[PDB]
Each structure stands twice: as C-alpha cells, then as structure tokens.
Ligand SMILES: *[C@@H]1O[C@H](CO)[C@@H](O[C@@H]2O[C@H](CO)[C@@H](O)[C@H](O)[C@H]2NC(C)=O)[C@H](O)[C@H]1NC(C)=O
Ligand SMILES: *[C@@H]1O[C@H](CO)[C@@H](O[C@@H]2O[C@H](CO)[C@@H](O)[C@H](O)[C@H]2NC(C)=O)[C@H](O)[C@H]1NC(C)=O
Ligand SMILES: *[C@@H]1O[C@H](CO)[C@@H](O[C@@H]2O[C@H](CO)[C@@H](O)[C@H](O)[C@H]2NC(C)=O)[C@H](O)[C@H]1NC(C)=O
Ligand SMILES: *[C@@H]1O[C@H](CO)[C@@H](O[C@@H]2O[C@H](CO)[C@@H](O)[C@H](O)[C@H]2NC(C)=O)[C@H](O)[C@H]1NC(C)=O
Ligand SMILES: *[C@@H]1O[C@H](CO)[C@@H](O)[C@H](O)[C@H]1NC(C)=O
C-alpha cells in the first residue's frame with residue numbers, strides 16, 4: 221500500500237515475477253505429488269457386507285460408517301497426533317486439490333481391492349479369490365509350501381490379530 | 396466455494412472427472428447449453444467385487460498392449476561471460492568490477508560442472524552396449 | 533548469443549544416439565537378455 | 572500433447588535465458604540503463620557512482636540465474652538416473668517389479684530416442700475375459716489331503732479340475748498334479764473327490 | 770531512505786524462495802519413494818530385501 | 820549513439836518516419852544514415868572462449 225515505493229520497485233526489472241512463478245510451480249508440484257501417490261485405482265472397490273475372511277479381522281483398518289468422515293480407527297488415531305493463516309501481509313495459503321475425504325476413499329478402495337482380489341486388481345480387472353487361498357499364494361512366494369498355512373490357519377489368524385492390537389496400542393500410547 | 400468464490404459458472408448436482416482443477420475438490424469444465432459448469436469431482440466408477448469364500452474368477456483370454464513412457468534425460472548446456480555481460484566493452488567498468496574479488500570464476504565453475512554432468516547423464520543412459528549389433532538382412 | 537552468453541554443443545551427436553538405440557534394439561530382438569550379461 | 576515433458580524443459584531454458592537477457596535494460600536506480608551513455612555524459616567521480624549501482628544489479632541477476640540453473644540441473648540428473656535404471660532393467664531383461672515397466676505383466680521394452688529425452692515402448696500381458704468357478708483348498712481321497720503342485724482346484728458344477736492360475740486350461744486331477752500331506756481333518760473347507768492314479 | 774528497505778526485503782524474499790525450492794525438491798523425492806512403495810509393496814509382493 | 824559492431828548492407832522495409840530498429844530482446848540496429856537513406860544492420864563482433 222505505497223504508490224511511491226511501488227514505482228521505485230519497477231526500476232529493478234522483473235525480480236517480482238520470478239518469485240511468484242517459482243511459488244506457483246511449487247504449488248503445482250505439491251498437488252501432483254498427492255495425485256500420483258494415492259490415485260492408482262481406476263475404480264472404487266468396496267468390501268462385501270459379510271466379513272468371512274478365514275478368521276482374519278480387518279475391522280481396525282476398514283472404514284467406520286458411524287464417524288461423520290469415512291476414516292478408519294487407525295486413521296482417526298493418526299490424525300489426532302499431529303498438531304497445527306494468521307499473517308496479514310501479502311501472505312496466503314491455498315487449499316489442497318484433494319480433501320481428506322477423497323484421500324480416505326482412495327485408501328479404502330486400495331485396501332478393499334487388496335483384501336478381495338489380491339494383486340490381480342493392479343494388472344487388469346479385479347478377480348475375486350478367498351483370502352485363505354490368497355495367503356497360500358503369498359506363502360508360496362517366499363518358498364514355503366501352502367500346506368504349512370492350511371494346517372495352521374487359526375494360529376496365523378490369531379497372531380495377525382494380536383499384532384494389529386499391539387500396533388493400535390503403540391499408536392495410541394506413544395506420541 | 397471453499398477455495399474462494401466463482402462468478403461466471405453454474406453449479407451442477409452431478410459429478411464427473413476433473414477437467415480444470417479449482418481447489419478443495421471442485422473442478423470446472425466446458426459442457427457441450429454451451430456454458431461453463433462447476434461440479435464436485437468424482438474419483439471413479441463404483442465397483443463391488445462378488446467376494447465369496449468358495450468362489451474364484453479365472454481369465455480365459457488375454458490381450459497384448461503397448462504403452463509409451465516419455466521422460467527427459469539432459470538439458471541444454473550453456474556458458475556465460477562475466478565481464479562481457481556486466482561491463483561489455485568498457486575499461487572503466489572492468490576496473491571497478493574486479494574490486495568484488497572472485498565472484499566471476501565461481502560462477503563459470505558451477506556452469507562448467509553443470510555442462511559436464513549434462514554429458515555424463517547421456518553417457519550413463521545410452522552407452523550400455525559394448526558392441527554395435529546388427530539385425531540380419 | 534549476443535551478450536557474452538553461448539550455448540555449447542553436446543558431445544554425442546544425434547546420429548550416435550540413434551546408433552545406440554539401434555544396437556540395443558537389434559541385440560534385444562536377436563539375443564533376448566543374454567547380450568546384457570555376457571556375449 | 573504426448574510430449575509435454577520434453578517441451579517443458581525447452582520452454583524453461585528458453586524463458587530463463589530470455590529473462591536474463593532482458594534484465595540488461597533496467598536502471599536499478601541509475602540515470603540510464605546503458606553505461607556507454609553514462610560514461611559519455613558525466614565526470615568519473617559520479618560516473619562510477621552510477622556504474623557500481625549497475626554492477627550490483629547485474630551481479631545479482633547473474634547469481635539468481637546460476638542458482639536456478641543449479642536446481643534445475645539437479646532435477647534433470649534425478650530424472651536421468653531413473654531413465655538409466657529403466658533402460659538397465661526393463662530393456663536388458665524382464666522385470667518383476669509391479670508397475671515399473673508399464674501396467675500389467677511386463678514382457679519386453681524397446682527404446683527410442685527423442686530431443687533431450689528417451690521414449691520406451693513397454694509391451695505387457697493383460698487378461699481379458701473372466702469366468703466363475705468353485706474352489707477348494709484340498710481334496711480327500713482315502714483320508715489323505717492332496718494339494719495342487721502348482722495351480723488351483725476348480726469346478727464347473729459337477730466335475731473337479733486343476734488349472735493354472737493365469738489362464739483357464741483344465742486338466743484331470745491325478746498324482747502328477749498334486750502332493751499329499753497328512754490326513755484331512757485339519758483343513759477348513761476341504762471337499763473330497765476321487766483322484767486318478769495313472 | 771526507502772531504497773534500503775527495498776533492498777533488504779528483496780533479499781529476504783529471495784532467501785526464503787530458495788530455501789523453499791530446496792525443501793520442495795526433498796519432499797518430491799520422498800513422495801516418489803512413497804509412490805514406488807505403494808506400487809510395489811501394496812499392489813503386489815516384493816522380493817527386494819528390506 | 821556509441822557502439823561497436825560490423826555494418827552490413829540491409830534488405831528490410833522501413834517506413835518514411837521510422838529511423839531506428841529493435842530486436843526481440845531490446846537490441847539496436849541503427850539505420851538512418853544522417854547523410855543518405857541507407858539501411859544498415861548492426862551485428863556484434865565475433866567472440867568466443869579459448
Ligand atoms: C474384530 O476385532 C474387533 C476389535 O477391534 C472386535 O470388536 C470388539 O468385540 C468385543 C467382543 O468380544 C467387544 O467387547 C469390543 O467392544 C469390540 N470392539 C469394538 C471397537 O467394537 C470384533 O468383534 C472382532 N471381529 C470378530 C468377528 O470377532
Ligand atoms: C480371445 O480374444 C481374441 C481377440 O482379443 C479373439 O480373436 C477374435 O476372434 C473373433 C472370433 O469370434 C474374430 O472375429 C476376430 O477377428 C478375432 N480377433 C483377432 C484380433 O484375431 C479370440 O477368438 C478369443 N478367444 C476365444 C477362445 O474366444
Ligand atoms: C463340466 O465339465 C465336464 C467335463 O467336460 C462336462 O462333462 C462332459 O459334458 C459334455 C457335454 O457338456 C459331454 O459330452 C461329456 O460326455 C461329459 N463328460 C463326462 C466325463 O461326463 C460337464 O457336462 C460339465 N458340466 C456343466 C454343468 O457344464
Ligand atoms: C468325505 O467322504 C466321507 C466318506 O468316506 C464322508 O464321511 C461321512 O460323513 C457323514 C456326515 O457326517 C457321516 O454321517 C458318515 O458317517 C461319514 N462316513 C465315514 C465313512 O466317515 C464325508 O462327509 C465326506 N466329506 C464331506 C466334506 O462331505
Ligand atoms: C441439488 O439437489 C437438491 C435436492 O436434492 C436441490 O435442493 C438443489 O437445488 C440442487 N442443486 C441445483 C444446482 O439445482
């Protein structure tokens with residue numbers, strides 16, 4: 221707010237446009253990052269109403285319809301652990317292109333495709349497969365026969381549930 | 396909107412892909428009434444796999460697809476002259492420029508390093524064959 | 533190129549790049565991946 | 572519009588050079604933007620007072636340009652490293668890394684040159700048409716439990732077959748497709764059917 | 770008396786913009802790593818150690 | 820106006836009132852000879868780096 225200063229400023233050439241251009245490029249890059257990291261699914265998959273996953277319990281990571289936002293339990297824990305516009309010079313902040321609900325929907329679609337189809341949804345179209353057989357397919361990947369899994373299924377299910385409980389407690393306790 | 400206020404476009408209750416991003420999940424596009432519309436972007440088509448504990452889906456046919464990927468390798472090499480740019484053809488100017496020590500050589504050094512790495516990039520990208528092979532006639 | 537600024541030419545001309553991308557393409561077709569490990 | 576990536580680099584370089592050249596016609600507070608006029612219009616004691624102001628302005632311009640060039644060169648090197656890695660892995664071999672050499676199952680790649688860049692043509696395998704079946708983790712035959720050596724057990728409603736996982740090609744279940752492991756009172760979801768012995 | 774303020778504030782803006790550019794490059798590298806991990810660890814099974 | 824360069828013959832169309840000549844980036848091509856109506860192109864003397 222000075223007509224005298226803004227006229228002396230024009231004698232310096234174009235130092236005032238390069239900074240704006242650089243900051244605009246930074247903003248575009250920050251949008252592109254979020255676009256390329258999460259948006260990797262063509263469709264929006266969702267889990268079947270009945271959860272028969274061979275004994276595995278994904279209720280801690282699946283979205284919670286009761287909350288106003290469709291975030292999971294662990295996401296709700298995470299969003300409360302990070303703390304922190306008031307300036308009124310030529311300083312402003314812009315809102316991100318994708319709201320938090322859109323990010324939550326992306327991470328829900330990815331997880332609900334992973335549970336039901338496995339890795340077939342990343343190549344072509346999602347192909348359904350029972351989770352107990354998908355885990356055998358994954359065990360064969362690391363050079364362990366599938367009869368090891370099929371004869372111990374309850375043990376692996378219990379260990380996975382206990383590990384999820386431990387990770388939830390660790391996130392809830394330590395800051 | 397939540398990203399400001401928009402005048403000249405009409406709100407639509409539908410939802411499509413994003414054409415011109417605006418912010419806070421709002422995108423604008425040129426429809427067909429021949430106007431400009433501002434909607435809420437949609438992530439994609441809804442889908443729900445028919446998961447069951449004793450059901451499988453096995454493909455019975457395939458298709459071959461060819462995909463392009465474009466990415467840069469090297470930029471344009473350049474070099475600049477200190478005195479010829481700052482004090483072009485002026486002895487009285489070059490007799491004051493050197494009072495600033497060595498601000499000159501430390502710019503040409505950086506530019507030379509950039510120029511050398513610009514050739515190192517192409518060399519490491521393309522030169523990966525010991526011999527030049529030939530296809531049969 | 534008028535105020536003390538010049539543009540240097542690249543070390544590899546546009547013909548040598550084409551020769552490289554032709555050698556790679558002719559090796560891949562006729563030898564598979566075996567031309568990358570040994571002979 | 573496919574080659575925006577390579578056009579952006581050229582545009583950025585040209586625009587930076589244009590800005591650097593255009594920075595010469597600025598007073599920076601001096602009486603005139605050309606020092607030849609200053610030297611031919613005033614005595615040295617104030618000619619130098621104008622000259623050093625011009626010097627400071629032009630030196631600041633050069634330093635800004637050099638810093639921007641350094642940052643852009645770092646970014647270009649970061650991209651060239653990825654290009655070299657893709658040439659080493661996608662072209663000179665077959666890559667099992669998912670979505671690294673194109674969407675789908677990677678088969679081969681072909682390189683093509685471009686102005687200040689490279690272009691890859693990834694060839695990929697994609698399944699097309701699907702079906703529905705009814706699987707089972709294993710099969711009891713005589714109290715035993717046969718698991719597939721490689722593949723899945725599928726049924727078309729009445730008969731049970733064993734097929735590979737990526738392409739429908741059913742075959743009769745026999746002792747050359749399955750292996751035995753213990754009894755079958757532990758596996759969950761097992762269904763028992765006859766197993767042929769050649 | 771205003772030229773000095775103009776020079777100082779211009780230098781402050783230049784410094785801030787340069788630091789922001791470097792930090793943005795670092796964040797871009799981290800985002801590329803995250804995208805690669807999402808493509809490989811999640812959408813498939815990885816044989817790369819650690 | 821002072822300046823160094825090499826003056827070649829010109830093939831360009833001025834207007835009866837236009838005297839000087841500018842370029843894409845603020846470069847001068849002085850034309851109107853104060854004794855005749857010749858057109859002249861001012862291009863800088865060659866330079867390089869050894
Ligand atoms: C999956 O785990 C959740 C816990 O994360 C289970 O929900 C709990 O169930 C017990 C019943 O024994 C209740 O006392 C808890 O209050 C529940 N917790 C929450 C947060 O709802 C859920 O039952 C498990 N799923 C199955 C099928 O057992
Ligand atoms: C698998 O798909 C291919 C095409 O992707 C099918 O090939 C086509 O077959 C029809 C016959 O119904 C022909 O009219 C087309 O000309 C064929 N296309 C090509 C490109 O050859 C093929 O038949 C399918 N396989 C099966 C078993 O249905
Ligand atoms: C499931 O597949 C089996 C194997 O092909 C089918 O049995 C054959 O069916 C054809 C006609 O559909 C007959 O000509 C053959 O004689 C049958 N073979 C035997 C050994 O019986 C069976 O029909 C299929 N079931 C369904 C519901 O399609
Ligand atoms: C596998 O075959 C056996 C027969 O050899 C079936 O066992 C019978 O199951 C019924 C249902 O509980 C019992 O009433 C019979 O006494 C069982 N017979 C024997 C000899 O044990 C068994 O049901 C078959 N498997 C499945 C999944 O049905
Ligand atoms: C969208 O629909 C609601 C009712 O579902 C209605 O009140 C509103 O006016 C509609 N928006 C527009 C732009 O017509």
Ligand SMILES: *[C@@H]1O[C@H](CO)[C@@H](O)[C@H](O)[C@H]1NC(C)=O
Pocket residue numbers: 445701702703
């Ligand atoms: C398999 O069954 C589901 C549910 O009945 C159905 O939606 C799907 O289209 C079927 N698959 C095919 C290939 O028809």
Ligand SMILES: *[C@@H]1O[C@H](CO)[C@@H](O)[C@H](O)[C@H]1NC(C)=O
Pocket residue numbers: 272448449759760
């Ligand atoms: C599979 O689900 C059905 C209900 O849809 C159930 O009756 C059956 O017991 C389940 N299979 C196993 C092995 O529990």
Ligand SMILES: *[C@@H]1O[C@H](CO)[C@@H](O)[C@H](O)[C@H]1NC(C)=O
Pocket residue numbers: 853854855
């Ligand atoms: C004076 O200038 C005019 C301009 O064209 C020219 O025709 C004439 O020859 C000149 N005379 C002398 C003596 O220089």
